[PDB]
């Protein structure tokens, strides 16, 4: 079990740790988060009580270093930092635990939610979407735009998701205009899977990462990416059987985890009705279709 200690909590903030969150009052004696499960990526995220503008946060993997949060009064945000001195770090974490100034990552043992949402997500790939290689963790926030959004402005702070565009020369083979536009199998399997992502896991990992950025930061371009990657699969007549089954699990846990009240803004009505009811894969997402119809039948 790993720890993300905090130097302090100088400003009132809602702190998020994966799908959990808690309130920290201005200058409350808070020194971080303990018992974080090794083996998964994690995201620690923040919404200031005084300005819920800018949710922001850090994707990280405790196996990649010792990380702590420290408020920066100049830049005005909780910053993740790496401590290279491993002994200093252990000493700090031990003191804070002894004084019990840490909240415990509150994982229910029966609960595989976080694993199921991050199954295919790898820090290595996160660090390619979020380019800031001097750090081993990755900063995301609400307002970061995607490479594709900048096409239609600061490239250093972009989300470098894989550009999917159904009406693009990449998506459409000359001579198969109708075929490729109505059955996107070539684009999914040949261009994206074999060509860009190399395998389904890397595809699913970006899809999951897009969803999580959409959910935790209300990052709109992430939501566009999540929906595009779903639609590309659902609009392919030919998808490996294991990918469909896994897709259905992936989306099931994403829909299960989405706040009931945030559905209106994170769920694209057109994409979901198309995917569940019109697309080639309309009959292949049984779990997802069942949770969607019972939880968000309005949208449908």
């Amino acid at each position: 079990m790993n720890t993300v200690p905090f130097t302090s909590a100088p400003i009132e903030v809602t702190i998020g740790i994966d799908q959990y969150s808690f309130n920290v009052k201005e200058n409350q004696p808070f020194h971080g988060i303990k018992d974080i499960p090794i083996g998964h990526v994690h995201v620690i995220h923040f919404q200031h009580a005084d300005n819920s503008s800018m949710r922001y946060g850090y994707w990280f993997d405790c196996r990649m270093g010792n990380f702590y949060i420290q408020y920066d009064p100049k830049d005005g945000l909780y910053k993740m930092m790496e401590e290279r001195d491993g002994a200093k770090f252990e000493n700090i974490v031990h003191n804070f635990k002894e004084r019990q100034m840490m909240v415990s990552y509150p994982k229910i043992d029966e609960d595989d939610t976080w694993y199921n949402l991050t199954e295919f997500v790898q820090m290595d790939k996160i660090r390619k979407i979020v380019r800031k290689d001097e750090n081993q963790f990755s900063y995301v926030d609400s307002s970061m735009t995607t490479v594709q959004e900048n096409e239609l402005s600061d490239p250093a702070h972009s989300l470098n998701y894989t550009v999917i565009n159904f009406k693009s020369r990449e998506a459409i083979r000359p001579g198969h205009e109708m075929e490729d536009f109505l059955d996107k199998s070539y684009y999914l399997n040949t261009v994206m899977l074999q060509g860009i992502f190399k395998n389904s896991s890397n595809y699913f990992g970006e899809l999951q990462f897009a969803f999580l950025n959409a959910m935790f930061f209300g990052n709109y371009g992430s939501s566009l990416q999540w929906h595009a990657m779903i639609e590309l699969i659902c609009s392919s007549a030919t998808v490996p059987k294991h990918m469909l089954d896994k897709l259905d699990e992936i989306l099931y846990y994403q829909i299960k985890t989405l706040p009931e009240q945030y559905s209106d803004i994170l769920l694209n009505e057109r994409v979901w009705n198309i995917c569940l009811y019109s697309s080639f894969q309309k009959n292949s997402l049984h779990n997802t279709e069942k949770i969607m119809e019972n939880k968000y039948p309005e949208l449908l």
Binding site: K167, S168, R169, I172, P174, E177, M178, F181
Partner: protein, 237 residues
């Protein structure tokens, strides 16, 4: 974006553009089978691609063989349309390619956009105008040529004949739409009006009779009365 009443004059500026109408691409007769079921028999169609400024009608004849062995023909027709318009643009020299293509039905937007990805600088636009281009098969001649075709074939007509020698493209387009609206609302009457007078003939290279300016005014007035006539017959007004 969309083409409507507000920007109606853009059609006649000097930016090359084409209207594309696909309403006569896929045409069928519906008949009873010996078993008493219903079947369709395709008949030749055409893509109506019109430069509203110059009067050029690039009339691509869609021979029924294009449908042979194909499923979902109403949907294929939009993609065939797109494929042919794209081929027409590619065949055209750069300085002749349209800057915009306006499709009369929105269902053509995605097919043509996809077929024209090689031409990102050609704007594909819908229109809110109800244009009567479906009646193009009522222009006597046009019905005759698309129905005699035995193979795919592109035919050129000036749909304005030599009118632009005497009127602007705005006025020519308005004459054309009024003629087509009339033919669409009551084809028998419309043709009666156009041909009542045997002394006025249709030139070999023309679609319409050689009316004098004064005779066009009379003709145009009679076509309005017809459209107004059918309007009352339809609505009992």
């Amino acid at each position: 974006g969309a083409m409507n009443s507000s920007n109606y004059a853009e059609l006649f500026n000097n930016d090359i553009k084409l209207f594309v109408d696909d309403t006569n691409v896929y045409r069928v007769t519906v008949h009873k089978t010996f078993e008493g079921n219903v079947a369709t028999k395709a008949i030749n169609g055409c893509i109506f691609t019109l430069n509203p400024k110059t009067g050029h009608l690039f009339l691509k004849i869609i021979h029924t063989s294009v449908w042979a062995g194909q499923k979902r023909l109403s949907q294929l027709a939009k993609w065939k349309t797109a494929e042919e318009v794209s081929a027409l643009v590619r065949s055209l020299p750069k300085e002749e390619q349209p800057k915009q293509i306006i499709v009369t039905r929105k269902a053509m937007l995605d097919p043509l956009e996809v077929h024209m990805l090689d031409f990102p600088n050609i704007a594909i636009r819908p229109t809110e105008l109800r244009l009567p281009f479906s009646a193009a098969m009522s222009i006597d001649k046009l019905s005759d040529v698309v129905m005699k075709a035995t193979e795919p074939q592109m035919v050129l007509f000036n749909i304005y004949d030599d009118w632009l020698d005497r009127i602007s493209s705005y006025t020519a387009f308005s004459r054309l739409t009024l003629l087509l609206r009339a033919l669409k609302t009551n084809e028998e009457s419309a043709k009666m009006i156009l041909l009542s007078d045997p002394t006025i003939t249709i030139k070999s290279y023309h679609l319409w009779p050689s009316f004098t300016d004064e005779q066009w005014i009379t003709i145009e007035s009679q076509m309005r009365d017809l459209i107004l006539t059918e309007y009352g017959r339809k609505y009992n007004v």
